[PDB]
Amino acid sequence: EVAAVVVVGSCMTDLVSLTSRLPKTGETIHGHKFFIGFGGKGANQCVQAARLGAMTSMVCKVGKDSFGNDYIENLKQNDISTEFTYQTKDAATGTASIIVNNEGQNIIVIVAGANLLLNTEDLRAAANVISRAKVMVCQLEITPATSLEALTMARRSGVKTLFNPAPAIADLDPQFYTLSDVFCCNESEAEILTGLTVGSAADAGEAALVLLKRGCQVVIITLGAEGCVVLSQTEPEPKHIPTEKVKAVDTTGAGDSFVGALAFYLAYYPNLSLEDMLNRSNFIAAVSVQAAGTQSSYPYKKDLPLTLFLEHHHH
Amino acid sequence: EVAAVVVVGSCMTDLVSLTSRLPKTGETIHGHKFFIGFGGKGANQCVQAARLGAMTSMVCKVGKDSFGNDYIENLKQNDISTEFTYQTKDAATGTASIIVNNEGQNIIVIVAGANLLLNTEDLRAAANVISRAKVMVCQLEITPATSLEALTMARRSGVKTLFNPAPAIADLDPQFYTLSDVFCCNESEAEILTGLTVGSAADAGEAALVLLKRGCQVVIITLGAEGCVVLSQTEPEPKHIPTEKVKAVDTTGAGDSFVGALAFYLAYYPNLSLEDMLNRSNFIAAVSVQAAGTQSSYPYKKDLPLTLFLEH
Ligand SMILES: Nc1ncnc2c1ncn2[C@@H]1O[C@H](COP(=O)(O)CP(=O)(O)O)[C@@H](O)[C@H]1O
Numbered sequence: 372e373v374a375a376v377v378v379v380g381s382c383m384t385d386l387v388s389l390t391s392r393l394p395k396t397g398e399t400i401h402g403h404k405f406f407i408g409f410g411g412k413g414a415n416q417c418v419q420a421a422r423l424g425a426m427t428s429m430v431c432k433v434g435k436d437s438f439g440n441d442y443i444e445n446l447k448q449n450d451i452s453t454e455f456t457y458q459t460k461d462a463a464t465g466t467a468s469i470i471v472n473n474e475g476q477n478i479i480v481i482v483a484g485a486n487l488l489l490n491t492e493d494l495r496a497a498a499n500v501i502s503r504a505k506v507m508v509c510q511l512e513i514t515p516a517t518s519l520e521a522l523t524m525a526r527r528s529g530v531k532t533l534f535n536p537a538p539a540i541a542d543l544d545p546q547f548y549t550l551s552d553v554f555c556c557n558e559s560e561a562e563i564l565t566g567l568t569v570g571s572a573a574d575a576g577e578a579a580l581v582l583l584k585r586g587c588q589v590v591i592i593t594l595g596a597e598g599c600v601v602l603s604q605t606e607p608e609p610k611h612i613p614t615e616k617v618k619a620v621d622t623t624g625a626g627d628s629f630v631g632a633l634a635f636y637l638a639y640y641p642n643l644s645l646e647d648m649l650n651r652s653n654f655i656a657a658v659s660v661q662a663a664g665t666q667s668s669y670p671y672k673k674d675l676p677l678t679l680f681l682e683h684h685h686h
Numbered sequence: 687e688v689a690a691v692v693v694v695g696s697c698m699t700d701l702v703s704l705t706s707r708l709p710k711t712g713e714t715i716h717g718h719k720f721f722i723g724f725g726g727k728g729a730n731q732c733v734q735a736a737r738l739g740a741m742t743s744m745v746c747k748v749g750k751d752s753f754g755n756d757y758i759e760n761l762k763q764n765d766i767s768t769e770f771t772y773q774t775k776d777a778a779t780g781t782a783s784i785i786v787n788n789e790g791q792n793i794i795v796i797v798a799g800a801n802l803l804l805n806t807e808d809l810r811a812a813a814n815v816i817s818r819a820k821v822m823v824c825q826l827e828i829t830p831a832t833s834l835e836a837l838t839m840a841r842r843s844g845v846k847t848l849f850n851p852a853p854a855i856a857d858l859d860p861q862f863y864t865l866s867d868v869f870c871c872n873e874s875e876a877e878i879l880t881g882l883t884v885g886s887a888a889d890a891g892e893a894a895l896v897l898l899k900r901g902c903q904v905v906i907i908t909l910g911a912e913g914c915v916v917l918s919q920t921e922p923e924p925k926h927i928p929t930e931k932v933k934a935v936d937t938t939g940a941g942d943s944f945v946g947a948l949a950f951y952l953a954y955y956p957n958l959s960l961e962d963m964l965n966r967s968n969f970i971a972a973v974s975v976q977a978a979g980t981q982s983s984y985p986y987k988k989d990l991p992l993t994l995f996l997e998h
């Protein structure tokens with residue numbers, strides 16, 4: 372019935388061309404395959420949460436176009452509520468044009484498009500759904516002011532905020548930190564936000580402390596194959612949560628799998644320690660890296676170990 | 687209604703992102719605008735001819751996908767026959783993914799897709815329409831075997847062949863020249879095809895002669911703002927046909943406008959001199975450069991000077 376996880380954020384149509392070599396400036400090349408995929412950090416996170424069993428709702432804006440209609444169907448196919456998936460005639464659906472060579476290297480051009488037109492009126496119409504959620508997740512692929520509005524609304528209603536400052540902006544409004552219950556970013560984002568080098572767990576501990584002092588309640592920095600680091604106002608000493616070693620097929624979208632899993636745990640297992648939530652989220656994201664693609668790689672509950680769903684702390 | 691102009695060639699969806707900077711390897715950048723356009727050199731040429739008043743037929747193959755369905759509607763809206771516009775589940779509609787910066791530099795990735803699956807069986811179904819046409823137009827965006835068969839069919843029925851070797855490749859099948867009544871390309875294509883540097887109308891004349899001696903009857907090299915150069919087996923001395931100076935808004939698709947205009951004139955105004963046809967085609971192409979986009983820039987007869995359509 373009630374959506375426990377509300378994601379206010381982005382949907383993007385992935386337009387993928389496969390080539391033998393990447394083009395340089397000025398070059399026309401021929402590729403050998405083109406296909407369409409569904410992306411956007413907001414939708415990616417929402418899709419992972421939904422596949423773990425969350426009742427989710429996506430607050431987003433697409434175009435009144437073929438891509439937008441397709442995106443709505445993609446959400447429905449993932450059992451996501453589309454009651455706040457808005458459409459606009461005033462911009463195309465967001466796009467990621469992606470060129471990939473035979474080694475899996477890419478160039479990407481993102482046009483946020485309709486995502487940027489998600490506005491105050493849209494959030495007001497979503498106010499009841501936001502207010503009744505357990506967790507509100509947002510990123511920085513819509514207009515920053517709209518993400519800030521959503522954080523504000525959630526905070527005012529006592530709804531847990533999960534903020535993923537991605538892609539990062541060097542001088543974020545200070546309110547982004549003070550309105551974030553959980554602030555989760557990757558190493559490259561942490562570098563932009565703090566002006567520190569972040570390559571290692573040690574580095575992430577230092578960066579996390581800078582972010583915590585700006586007013587976050589919890590800070591998590593993800594570290595690829597090294598797992599993640601967390602600290603909080605209650606426990607300000609950095610804790611490194613490793614992830615078990617796997618053979619990565621395709622790491623694309625791992626960050627969004629991680630965040631979607633964390634949203635699921637915050638909503639449905641609020642009793643658990645951060646450490647527990649993060650061990651589980653690490654494991655889920657590590658499953659995603661062992662499969663090709665972004666949304667297509669995200670696991671479903673039925674294909675995951677039963678231990679990930681126990682109410683109490685586990686070893 | 688008998689089609690006078692038959693175009694056997696490509697339909698492509700243009701997926702255009704406008705950016706401040708072009709991305710380097712491994713980089714994600716954010717751009718400021720995305721749009722979809724109808725393109726493909728075959729379709730572009732067919733659309734310009736149709737807008738001038740030609741009865742046209744587009745022989746092509748698109749996907750059984752949204753892009754393909756949309757493409758078919760695009761052709762119908764331009765009054766083009768789609769009797770031999772095929773759809774396949776075996777590849778997506780052709781795509782051109784185009785990134786452009788604010789200085790107009792670009793990165794382009796073409797995936798010809800369904801265009802490549804237009805096969806000789808598909809062509810043969812069109813034999814009656816080809817046989818009753820005045821002009822057959824082909825390019826180098828579908829499979830070579832298919833384009834060669836189309837030109838062969840036209841020749842067998844005494845239908846004029848107009849061939850646009852675009853995009854160009856160094857080692858083009860010799861038959862493309864010998865099957866071409868009119869062979870029309872741009873300066874950068876002529877350079878690839880001949881190995882000559884083309885940096886003037888005089889240089890274009892020299893490259894054109896190489897193309898002529900490979901077996902073409904008429905060779906036209908288009909020269910952007912400098913108009914075009916023509917020679918023929920009957921008159922091998924190069925003739926430079928200037929175009930009047932205009933303020934270009936967007937030169938994208940001008941070559942296809944030029945070729946589609948030329949097809950229209952070859953089909954419906956056969957008694958005009960070649961020089962006259964090229965002056966008119968230059969003028970129509972120069973209108974196209976004064977508007978943004980490709981097919982959205984191609985003028986209609988109703989918006990053009992009446993003198994372009996007077997005989998003699
Ligand atoms: N190679 C790898 N092996 C195992 N887990 C991985 C992994 N790459 C990523 N992960 C998992 O996915 C989470 C998020 O990944 P990232 O820190 O890589 C985000 P990004 O920096 O690539 O955008 C990690 O914290 C970890 O749990």
Ligand SMILES: Nc1ncnc2c1ncn2[C@@H]1O[C@H](COP(=O)(O)CP(=O)(O)O)[C@@H](O)[C@H]1O
Nearest residue numbers: 872908909910911913934940941944968971972
């Ligand atoms: N800047 C410009 N001013 C006027 N006419 C132009 C022009 N650029 C192109 N044209 C017209 O369009 C014709 C074809 O253009 P191009 O020679 O540039 C072929 P392409 O660059 O589209 O491949 C020219 O012969 C000329 O008639």
Ligand SMILES: [Cl-]
Nearest residue numbers: 705706717718
């Ligand atoms: Cl920009």
Ligand SMILES: [K+]
Nearest residue numbers: 621659662668
């Ligand atoms: K993956």
Ligand SMILES: [K+]
Nearest residue numbers: 936974979983
């Ligand atoms: K134009």
Ligand SMILES: [Mg+2]
Nearest residue numbers: 595622625626
């Ligand atoms: Mg990673």
Ligand SMILES: [Mg+2]
Nearest residue numbers: 910937940941
């Ligand atoms: Mg040009």
